[PDB]
């Protein structure tokens, strides 16, 4: 009824969570990439 102004932070927090998951994934990916001589 009045708590409607709460879902927008709920969306952005999970967006940032999956975003940082992708970030650490690509971090590990580039760490593997730089293992080059």
């Amino acid at each position: 009824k009045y708590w409607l102004q709460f879902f927008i932070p709920l969306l952005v927090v999970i967006l940032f969570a999956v975003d940082t998951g992708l970030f650490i994934s690509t971090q590990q990916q580039v760490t593997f990439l730089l293992k080059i001589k």
Binding site: Q5, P9, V12, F16, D19, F23, V30, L33, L34
Partner: peptide, 29 residues
């Protein structure tokens, strides 16, 4: 509510800075 945005606001700042570091160290490599 008013303070709720404060916790997540510097989250973006630290992610942007860490992205800058990642970009500089991929351009180095």
């Amino acid at each position: 509510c008013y303070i709720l945005d404060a916790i997540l606001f510097l989250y973006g700042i630290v992610l942007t800075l860490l992205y800058c570091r990642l970009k500089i160290q991929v351009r180095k490599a």
